[PDB]
């Protein structure tokens, strides 16, 4: 049985800049966690009612955490700080996106600064590109040489998830399932 419980029922999720990917192959897919869903469900290139009748070579399970106002970017042909600098989906993305409000899990009263996201990057991310570099971003004309100052900022910032914030600033756990010998039936 394909390990879908380990991805959705995970106690701790990864940051969007360092999104985790679970390579799932050679298994029987008990489509039930996505088959029926406070659960958002966006599919691209494939129908869910036809997933039980299709065999795939590999199925990738990408999981991370963003805020509510950024879930709209986890889609093909989207731009923004999350899409361009954290997690990008290709234009011909074949798969589904799942996201749910996790304000009762990833938000502390004193702020949950554990989840991070990438602010600055010299160029946009390619589809399915993961950049965990923490080099001081050079914005100006002078070099930085690992110095945090003017025009040389940390490329990562914290989300600070507090439960008293609006829905657009509450944590949302996202699970992106990509459908690529066909073994995942």
């Amino acid at each position: 049985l394909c390990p879908f419980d380990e991805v959705f029922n995970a106690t701790r999720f990864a940051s969007v800049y360092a999104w985790n990917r679970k390579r799932i192959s050679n298994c029987v897919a008990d489509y039930s966690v996505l088959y029926n869903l406070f659960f958002t469900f966006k599919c691209y290139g494939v129908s869910p009612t036809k997933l039980n009748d299709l065999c795939f070579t590999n199925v990738y399970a990408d999981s991370f955490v963003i805020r509510g106002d950024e879930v709209r970017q986890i889609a093909p042909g989207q731009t923004g700080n999350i899409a361009d600098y954290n997690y990008k989906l290709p234009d011909d993305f074949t798969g589904c996106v799942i996201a749910w409000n996790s304000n009762k899990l990833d938000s502390k009263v004193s702020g949950n600064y554990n989840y991070l996201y990438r602010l600055f990057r010299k160029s946009n991310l390619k589809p399915f590109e993961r950049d965990i570099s923490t080099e001081i971003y050079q914005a100006g004309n002078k070099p930085c040489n690992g110095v945090a100052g003017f025009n040389c900022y940390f490329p990562l910032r914290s989300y600070s998830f507090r439960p008293t914030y609006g829905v657009g600033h509450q944590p949302y756990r996202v699970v992106v399932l990509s459908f690529e010998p066909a073994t995942v039936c």
Partner: antibody
Amino acid sequence: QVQLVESGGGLVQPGRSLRLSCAASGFTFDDYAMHWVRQVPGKGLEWVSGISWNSGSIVYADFVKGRFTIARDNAKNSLFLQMNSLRAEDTALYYCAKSTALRHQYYYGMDVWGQGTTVTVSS
Amino acid sequence: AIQMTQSPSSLSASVGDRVTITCRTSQTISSYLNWYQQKPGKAPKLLIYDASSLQSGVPSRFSGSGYGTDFTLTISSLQPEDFATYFCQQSYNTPYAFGQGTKVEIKR
């Protein structure tokens, strides 16, 4: 409350010098970058200079060249701007601004502004 | 440099109207555009930072949007006390240049 107050403005002949001060209260001055912003009578805001919390990062707009010098005294919760070789186009009301984003991130905004001090360069 | 061009330079609207101010950048500044409000004879006050984040204490009728270029400030319901001058200011690269400003007037 958070508060900033500028001082030191007044008349100065062209070519002479003037020293501006900015007194801060109601927040941890040592943790935030500070800025100088000016405004020509009738024109828009113009950024002048900024300085990091530990003074390790110091900047000037090109119209400043090597005439002005920004500095701060974290023990006295004061920001300073030493203005030399003042010209007629330096006539403006000068604001002192605190940066919202804590520590070494000056890419968000100035939440707190003083009432400003007026500098007029004329013979 | 990072020239900031605002449009319009001046506008006249009544109480309750929806006002939208446009701010363009000479190059991409990602999402670090800031909006400020300034009354005649008063100091500027921060409204929006990081293109869309509302500053604490600012009424919810103010809202910002945009990414890269062509940023927009929106006042959903104009009130009498919104008469001022609205500046946009990029924070991607030094100098933290300001826009030319958009003076909002009210009619009665």
